[PDB]
Amino acid sequence: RTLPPGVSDEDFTSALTAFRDVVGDEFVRTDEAELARFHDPYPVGDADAHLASAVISPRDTEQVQEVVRIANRYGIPLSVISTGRNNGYGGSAPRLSGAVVVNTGERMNRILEVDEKLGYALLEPGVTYFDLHEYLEAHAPSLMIDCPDLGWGSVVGNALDRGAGYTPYGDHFMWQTGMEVVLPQGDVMRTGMGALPGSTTWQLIPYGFGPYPDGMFTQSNLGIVTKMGIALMQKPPASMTYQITFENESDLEQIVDIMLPLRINMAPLQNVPVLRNIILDAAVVSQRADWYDGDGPLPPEAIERMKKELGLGYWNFYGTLYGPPQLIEMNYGIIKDAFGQIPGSRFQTHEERHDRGAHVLQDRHKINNGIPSLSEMKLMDWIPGAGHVGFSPISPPVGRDAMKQFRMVRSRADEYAKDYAAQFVVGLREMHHIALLLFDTQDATARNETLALTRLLIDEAAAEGYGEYRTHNALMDQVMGTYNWGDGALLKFHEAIKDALDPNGIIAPGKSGVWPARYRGKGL
Amino acid sequence: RTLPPGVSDEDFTSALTAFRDVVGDEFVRTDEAELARFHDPYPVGDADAHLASAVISPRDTEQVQEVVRIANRYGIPLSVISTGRNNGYGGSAPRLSGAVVVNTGERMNRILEVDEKLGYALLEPGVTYFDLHEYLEAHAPSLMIDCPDLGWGSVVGNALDRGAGYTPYGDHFMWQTGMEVVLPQGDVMRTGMGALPGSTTWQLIPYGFGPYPDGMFTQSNLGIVTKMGIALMQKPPASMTYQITFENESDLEQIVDIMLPLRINMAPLQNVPVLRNIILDAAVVSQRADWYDGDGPLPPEAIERMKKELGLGYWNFYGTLYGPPQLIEMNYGIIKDAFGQIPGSRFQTHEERHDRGAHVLQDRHKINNGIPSLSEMKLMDWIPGAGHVGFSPISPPVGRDAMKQFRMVRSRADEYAKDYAAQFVVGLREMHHIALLLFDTQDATARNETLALTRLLIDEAAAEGYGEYRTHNALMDQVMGTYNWGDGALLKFHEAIKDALDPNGIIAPGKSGVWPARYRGKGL
Ligand SMILES: Cc1cc2nc3c(=O)[nH]c(=O)nc-3n(C[C@H](O)[C@H](O)[C@H](O)COP(=O)(O)OP(=O)(O)OC[C@H]3O[C@@H](n4cnc5c(N)ncnc54)[C@H](O)[C@@H]3O)c2cc1C
Ligand SMILES: Cc1cc2nc3c(=O)[nH]c(=O)nc-3n(C[C@H](O)[C@H](O)[C@H](O)COP(=O)(O)OP(=O)(O)OC[C@H]3O[C@@H](n4cnc5c(N)ncnc54)[C@H](O)[C@@H]3O)c2cc1C
Ligand SMILES: C=CCc1ccc(O)c(OC)c1
Ligand SMILES: C=CCc1ccc(O)c(OC)c1
User: Fold this and answer.
1) Does residue A4 lie within any of the structural domains?
2) CATH code: domain of residue B251
3) Domain interval for residue B316
4) Distance of residue A415 Cα from the nearest chain B Cα, in angstroms
5) Atom 11 of ligand 4: nearest residue by CA position
6) Residues A299-316, buried b or exposed e (16+ Cβ, 10 A)?
7) Chain B residues with beta carbon closer than 8 angstroms to that of A208
8) Which of A71, A293, B298, B465 shows the smallest number of beta carbons within 10 Å?
9) Is B470 a catalytic residue?
10) Burial classification of residue B7, based on how many CB atoms lie within 10 Å of its CB (0-12 exposed, 13-18 middle, 19 or more buried)
């Protein structure tokens, strides 16, 4: 029977009883089948590395407080999910193996408020992107969400890992406005203007008075968020999504150097521009075996067959334009004139192209207009048992930096027997190299190779000044270890805050490499 | 001789020697004349409530660390300035009377880096808006700053109080990207991507990996900032600034309800729109005694005389448009069509109007194009001895809320013998009611009236759900006291973090109402 680390069977028994007294017997799950459902679907290294001892589903903020106070009394470590679809980063699995999972989204799943005129929602953790889209279309259809690729995620949970989408409102944390949070000893607090009783402005400005704390609850184990505000963009009068195909792998340098000046003023590149390689686009509409059934890396001529059969480039640019038809036409003209300076570039609109090679184009047109989707899960049919682990370092949005990263990552992927499927994304002034490292989750050797490759990719990127933005449970200590300016000053700061707020070391120990004192330096 | 609270004459003597032993005797100032230069120029209250015992000017980050270590050894409270022009909020004076002021800006005054292509600067605290503008015009002239009304402030210090300007980059904290900060026991850390040694991305995205802490160093006593990055906007190819005069005080309701839908999408109201009342505008180009030398409030007839003599309305709207002339003309047409629905509304461009009543229009044209100015200091000639104290609560950008606040604040101002000079400002989804409470700094009764008025304005605003965003030393305990949801949960959270990071209770005690344990509950 899975026990949390540093808890006796006796204290675990006492805590489960107390949890049942709070949430109800139905909402304290310890059965083999429910615990298996909380396994990381895409484990790197050991499949058994991140297990839950129990899953608690609180009804509301007051029950979250009581479950946290019980955990404090019995030294129970509590991990936290909203919807628990953090696939690529551990899914619903706790960083600390044997933690009890607080399933906030099962019962705290209400849209509490939508203000259509002022453009905001107040949300509980269980509200999915699908839920919020459905609600806006029924009750506030002038508004749209900003969603990641997969709509089954949590508007709250994704913002709390500083996830992102692709409309002008793509930076989820930026548009997050106000939160309610249960602190690690059970006290509850509202941030920003919500700390003023009876305020009318909680969702209108993210800062209140005094030190601005909401960022400290993202990629964080400093509290359990029970409500979160988010600003919501008005739908424009019209939109159009376009695909630019680029024939040559070497076109990356010029694509990025044209992209940055067109994106830094948020026009004419009005949404978050994405540049997807052939594998990332092909894998949505085909399986690897369709192009190559041999051992080793995909041969060049399999890559060319994908490009030609699907009418795709090595690099495939997707952007969206918003406004009156006349502004869309004007902006599209500027984009076509600029990227058209690259020989071999081909431009196609979401109205022009409807073949198998336009599947991603039509999916980006949904996502870029706040219409959530699960079409991207077709990636995970590329090979049997496919899983992915996130690798997504930040770099300058400079073509020379893109080429260096393209070459560095692809050459290591070939060496570690993994396909190079990646995109370059420019937020505003920063570039992400988001590599989807696909591996057979059922093959111990493939799982171990994938962990080893990703550790190497993190270290080599850090050695060029490219830090990881977000990572899996298995990689959190390594990645925080790369942010070690001033003899590890940042982690020392985080540890001081962690121990002050969480003296009993309860909340998601080891999240982002930040361990409370009782678990620190134990190698788990 | 001014001594810090809870420090013996002996330990103060020892600490001053130790400070001199690091920074040099020239940079430890204890003379009556130098200490008087750190007086609040606009005291509310007793004119002697916020005194400095000494001013220390550290050379660099290492000396900041050593001065903080010295303060720890001797229990010296250390307040902090960059340029110390926080006028309206206490100027360079410490919240805790008798604190030693750390003058970061005197020696740490370099522009460390400007990247013209990626649009950012890395700055030390002593760089003024004038300094940065002069540097950009000389070395990176495609870029512009975002400045508050007065250019003598610090790009860093203003951002660290979550100050603001009026270009599209008006939210200073939002565009702040990366900082270096000395923590209260003398440890130094870099935030964001600057925690990764040799990173090239410190100024390109504000978040690194793990909890996002930069906000916790704004309106804060948790650290002494030594470097700060800020993003810089590209100059547009053209701009135009316009004035809309509205004849009637009651036009405010409709002005605000037309303004919000035009601002919430950041077009056609492309900059931060300001709506200034007749006094706020008249006070830039005239003195009160030019209109009225009787006693009591300005009579209605004097208000009408200001409107007629200067060609102004009761409310005066100023906005700027950016882009190609064709886009400026199009957006100006939408603005004129929308606000032109209000009878008596009159529209003039910065090209059309150059008379006395256009002084504010021509000054906004500078500020809205990142050309810093001191023209607004002419407000402080309105009456002899004029000082102001900030009052600027946040409300929904709704005409009914604007009218309620206009009436509530003006009626209390009349009762407390202060002129109602105010503006309404919409940032994006939030409204600010910024009242310039002018008083005779030389009159003990006027100082006490102004404090009593502002305490009343804060309490009445809070009761309507309108929280203060930023406040003076003398009002910090009251304002944090309004944010007391959850039996004062926010303050208890801040105190927990403050005592953990600052166990000796050194840094700017009482800033934002956050007192370390040794000074808490002492009535100072
Ligand atoms: C093929 C593929 C495509 C993807 N595309 C994207 C994409 O476009 N953009 C993107 O951002 N991600 C993407 N992801 C990554 C990830 O799947 C999504 O980010 C997903 O939305 C995150 O899971 P979630 O929304 O269920 O959040 P959760 O898993 O519920 O929460 C995420 C994390 O937030 C914290 N947390 C959650 N709830 C709370 C709470 N109430 N209080 C405190 N802490 C809490 C925990 O650390 C938790 O692990 C992709 C993944 C895959 C496999
Ligand atoms: C007529 C008038 C008009 C005004 N207009 C505006 C306006 O348009 N916009 C606006 O924002 N303000 C405005 N102000 C208010 C204020 O004067 C400015 O915000 C001014 O720029 C702030 O002072 P400063 O830049 O010198 O910063 P400082 O006084 O140097 O610093 C401000 C605060 O930041 C903190 N601090 C500073 N340096 C550090 C450091 N290195 N480490 C840690 N903490 C630090 C301290 O709390 C300090 O008190 C106006 C005031 C008046 C009187
Ligand atoms: C196709 C993948 C898109 C994607 C975007 C952002 C991410 O963090 C991510 O992590 C797995 C994946
Ligand atoms: C005319 C005053 C402009 C102004 C803007 C912002 C502020 O915080 C402020 O406080 C003094 C004044």
Assistant:
1) no
2) 3.40.462.10
3) 239-476
4) 26
5) B390
6) eeebbebbbeebebbbbb
7) 467, 469, 483, 490
8) A293
9) yes
10) buried
